[PDB]
Amino acid sequence: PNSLEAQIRQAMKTGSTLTIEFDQALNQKSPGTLNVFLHPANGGVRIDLDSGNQGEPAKILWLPWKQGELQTLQPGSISTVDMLFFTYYLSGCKVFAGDGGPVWHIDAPVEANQFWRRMSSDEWMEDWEVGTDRQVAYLHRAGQSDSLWNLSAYLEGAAPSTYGRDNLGQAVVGGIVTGRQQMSLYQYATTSSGSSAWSPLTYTLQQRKQ
Numbered sequence: 001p002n003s004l005e006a007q008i009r010q011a012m013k014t015g016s017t018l019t020i021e022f023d024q025a026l027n028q029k030s031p032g033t034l035n036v037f038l039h040p041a042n043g044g045v046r047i048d049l050d051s052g053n054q055g056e057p058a059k060i061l062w063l064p065w066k067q068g069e070l071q072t073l074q075p076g077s078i079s080t081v082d083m084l085f086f087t088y089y090l091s092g093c094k095v096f097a098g099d100g101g102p103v104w105h106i107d108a109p110v111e112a113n114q115f116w117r118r119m120s121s122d123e124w125m126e127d128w129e130v131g132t133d134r135q136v137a138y139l140h141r142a143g144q145s146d147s148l149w150n151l152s153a154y155l156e157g158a159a160p161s162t163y164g165r166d167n168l169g170q171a172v173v174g175g176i177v178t179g180r181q182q183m184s185l186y187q188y189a190t191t192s193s194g195s196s197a198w199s200p201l202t203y204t205l206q207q208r209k210q
């Protein structure tokens, strides 16, 4: 087979099944570029800081998870075509990504009005004028209470993407860098039924309402 990094990038693009296991220790690393090790795992790849166990070094873009908080990947971090991006597992969490803008990983219990308030101090958000459009990818868990994710007061456009059902399930989000400050996003979900194949996570047109 190819390098584990290439295997992931091909699984994403081809819409194949290839799971990702993350070491929790990665959440102690700040957002931005990160040197990790990739290893074979049952049905997929493990990403950690273990230099042994047939580990293959890779430089990725990384976005940690933090309890009760948002974490942000700034687009200034993004350059190298075909570099992979990952965030930690979504456990009821939300991911909001602006095309050419930041990516936010928001923990499950943070209310939508609160996380939008926090997001909106970012320079990319301040530059997004009411009545104008951006391309935004937004992913939440299906069946979660609407107060934890509904941004309809703020954005008009396509509905969010969802993962899971009945407020159960997890997701993995990653990406492939396509250029300066540019990435294409991919996702899969894990439920009682098993893990889905990768598919695109689509940026949709959104107009800012207020």
Ligand SMILES: [Br-]
Binding pocket: 092, 108, 109, 144, 167
């Ligand atoms: Br929840």
